[PDB]
Amino acid sequence: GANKTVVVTTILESPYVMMKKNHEMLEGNERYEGYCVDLAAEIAKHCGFKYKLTIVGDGKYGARDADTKIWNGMVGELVYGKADIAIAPLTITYVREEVIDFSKPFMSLGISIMIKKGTPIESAEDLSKQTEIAYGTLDSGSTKEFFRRSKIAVFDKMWTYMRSAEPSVFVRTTAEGVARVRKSKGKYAYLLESTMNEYIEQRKPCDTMKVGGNLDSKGYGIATPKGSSLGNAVNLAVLKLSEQGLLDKLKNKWWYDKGECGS
Amino acid sequence: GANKTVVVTTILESPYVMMKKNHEMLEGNERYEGYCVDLAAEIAKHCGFKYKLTIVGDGKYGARDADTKIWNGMVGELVYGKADIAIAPLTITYVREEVIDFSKPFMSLGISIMIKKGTPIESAEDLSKQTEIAYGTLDSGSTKEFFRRSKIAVFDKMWTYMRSAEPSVFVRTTAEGVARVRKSKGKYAYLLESTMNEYIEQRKPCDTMKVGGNLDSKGYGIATPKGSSLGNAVNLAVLKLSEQGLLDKLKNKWWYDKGECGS
Numbered sequence: 001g002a003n004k005t006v007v008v009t010t011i012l013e014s015p016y017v018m019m020k021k022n023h024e025m026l027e028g029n030e031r032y033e034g035y036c037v038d039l040a041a042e043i044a045k046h047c048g049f050k051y052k053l054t055i056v057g058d059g060k061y062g063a064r065d066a067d068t069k070i071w072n073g074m075v076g077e078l079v080y081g082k083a084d085i086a087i088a089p090l091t092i093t094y095v096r097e098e099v100i101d102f103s104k105p106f107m108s109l110g111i112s113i114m115i116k117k118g119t120p121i122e123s124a125e126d127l128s129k130q131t132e133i134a135y136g137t138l139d140s141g142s143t144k145e146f147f148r149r150s151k152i153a154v155f156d157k158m159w160t161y162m163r164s165a166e167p168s169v170f171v172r173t174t175a176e177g178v179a180r181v182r183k184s185k186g187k188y189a190y191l192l193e194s195t196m197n198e199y200i201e202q203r204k205p206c207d208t209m210k211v212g213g214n215l216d217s218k219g220y221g222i223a224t225p226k227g228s229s230l231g232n233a234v235n236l237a238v239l240k241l242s243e244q245g246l247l248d249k250l251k252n253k254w255w256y257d258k259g260e261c262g263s
Numbered sequence: 264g265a266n267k268t269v270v271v272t273t274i275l276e277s278p279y280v281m282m283k284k285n286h287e288m289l290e291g292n293e294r295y296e297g298y299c300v301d302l303a304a305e306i307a308k309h310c311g312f313k314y315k316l317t318i319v320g321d322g323k324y325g326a327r328d329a330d331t332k333i334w335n336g337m338v339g340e341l342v343y344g345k346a347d348i349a350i351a352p353l354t355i356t357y358v359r360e361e362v363i364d365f366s367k368p369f370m371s372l373g374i375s376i377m378i379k380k381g382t383p384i385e386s387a388e389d390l391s392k393q394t395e396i397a398y399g400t401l402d403s404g405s406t407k408e409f410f411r412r413s414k415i416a417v418f419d420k421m422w423t424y425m426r427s428a429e430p431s432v433f434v435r436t437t438a439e440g441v442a443r444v445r446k447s448k449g450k451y452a453y454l455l456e457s458t459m460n461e462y463i464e465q466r467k468p469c470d471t472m473k474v475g476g477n478l479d480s481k482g483y484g485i486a487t488p489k490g491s492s493l494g495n496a497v498n499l500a501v502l503k504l505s506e507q508g509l510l511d512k513l514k515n516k517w518w519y520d521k522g523e524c525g526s
């Protein structure tokens with residue numbers, strides 16, 4: 001048929017997608033800025049489509065309900081035909097790859113530990129061997145599923161603690177996890193992706209830091225409904241931008257060029 | 264060969280694929296050992312196929328002849344139907360993605376610099392600003408094509424030197440590049456992938472090292488002919504091995520430090 005505007009689902013997560021100054025008087029794509037906003041423009045240019053950025057209604061990345069088997073979040077938007085493509089920090093996983101298509105990765109990450117500066121923790125092993133410092137993850141995302149599914153001893157032990165901790169150690173947004181670290185005087189550590197960890201490390205008031213190596217190795221991919229014709233072009237577009245060095249420049253732009261914690 | 268046997272093309276490259284001690288009295292797949300040999304056994308187990316490891320005839324990774332547009336190396340064996348799958352340190356690239364299918368990556372790497380210890384080079388920009396130290400890459404692989412195609416200023420400069428330098432700064436195998444670094448009294452630096460660089464750095468005679476950050480970011484993927492029915496299962500197998508932590512275990516095994524260098 002005729003060309004249609006591509007519906008892009010994404011999520012309000014700094015610095016991938018953020019509300020612009022003066023958004024209250026702006027409309028459409030102009031309301032937003034950030035890494036994924038820039039990336040969407042580049043992909044659309046190379047692929048020759050027009051698009052509309054739409055923030056996912058429930059504010060979630062995507063998990064499948066154990067009983068109803070219904071997908072929520074951005075994954076759900078794709079699975080149920082509400083969006084044509086997701087351009088977001090959406091982690092490539094086995095269970096997701098089974099139900100949606102992913103491009104080759106446009107950014108790499110690993111699960112990591114965020115602490116308030118001075119917290120006596122240097123590794124996940126350290127966390128699992130004490131009880132004074134609480135720790136948790138984001139809901140409805142790939143980090144929580146990693147711990148839940150892990151057969152690796154240290155991570156299984158961490159999940160056994162987190163799943164039953166009271167009050168809840170899980171948070172609904174990355175921002176909530178960051179606040180909890182910042183406000184708990186070193187008694188909360190947050191498990192999150194190294195990308196978001198490194199970003200927060202560069203923001204005022206510069207009171208957090210990433211410690212230890214990453215617990216795993218994966219990446220974000222641009223996602224489409226299974227078998228979507230958009231897939232092939234978008235995938236080549238990611239590899240081209242990668243080869244051209246544009247993805248490296250975009251990360252530098254949003255993470256470090258305007259970092260708030262010094263040069 | 265035998266019916267229902269998957270033909271695997273691979274390449275002799277330590278520690279991915281190596282001839283076992285006393286291989287001359289062994290036969291078939293048992294002649295070989297290494298990271299990729301272990302990976303092939305794991306992939307074949309998950310996907311349920313029997314397979315035959317074959318070393319690529321011309322000992323090359325894969326490039327397209329500018330004149331004849333003919334692909335050589337492992338890429339060629341996939342394109343012209345000599346093999347069903349490549350399980351090897353074969354780099355995901357834009358130009359290759361256009362002609363073959365790649366799994367999601369099973370290992371990450373970047374282009375990196377290998378120098379003789381003591382060499383006064385700390386970066387790619389350093390190499391480009393001087394002319395006493397020669398430098399080159401492997402023929403018929405992705406590192407050479409990267410420099411040839413690059414519009415990034417420093418890399419374009421390096422390519423302008425390398426393509427015309429004489430005697431040829433290019434080498435036929437990784438071992439030959441490493442040997443040249445070791446014998447040139449510091450007057451040759453080798454551009455190779457960080458994985459191989461890191462492997463060599465830990466082996467006797469302990470006289471090489473990796474310097475600077477990586478020049479780019481990419482990975483190896485398991486490759487199949489375009490539209491192969493094997494693609495989907497192999498891809499899911501890679502993500503499953505990744506999430507089980509088996510790719511990390513395999514890396515730790517074949518990059519295991521026995522302390523040939525230092526403590």
Ligand SMILES: O=S1(=O)NCN(C2CC2)c2ccc(O)cc21
Pocket residue numbers: 092093105106107108109217218219220367368369370371482502505510
């Ligand atoms: O999630 S993935 O596509 N497969 C697993 N791996 C690691 C290398 C094995 C990575 C690594 C980096 C990346 O950007 C994406 C992936």
Ligand SMILES: O=S1(=O)NCN(C2CC2)c2ccc(O)cc21
Pocket residue numbers: 104105106107108219239242247355356368369370371372480481482483
């Ligand atoms: O070659 S790729 O599939 N696309 C480009 N990128 C980098 C993150 C943008 C990576 C990174 C790591 C990896 O293992 C594979 C790839």
Ligand SMILES: N[C@@H](CCC(=O)O)C(=O)O
Pocket residue numbers: 061062089090091138140141142143144191192193
């Ligand atoms: N990027 C993750 C969300 C963040 C996290 O789980 O730590 C996902 O796609 O689910």
Ligand SMILES: N[C@@H](CCC(=O)O)C(=O)O
Pocket residue numbers: 324325352353354401403404405406407454455456
């Ligand atoms: N992994 C490379 C070969 C080594 C190199 O080019 O440095 C390829 O697939 O072409």
Ligand SMILES: [Cl-]
Pocket residue numbers: 003004005
């Ligand atoms: Cl429309």
Ligand SMILES: [Cl-]
Pocket residue numbers: 283284285286
């Ligand atoms: Cl021998």
Ligand SMILES: [Cl-]
Pocket residue numbers: none
């Ligand atoms: Cl010329």
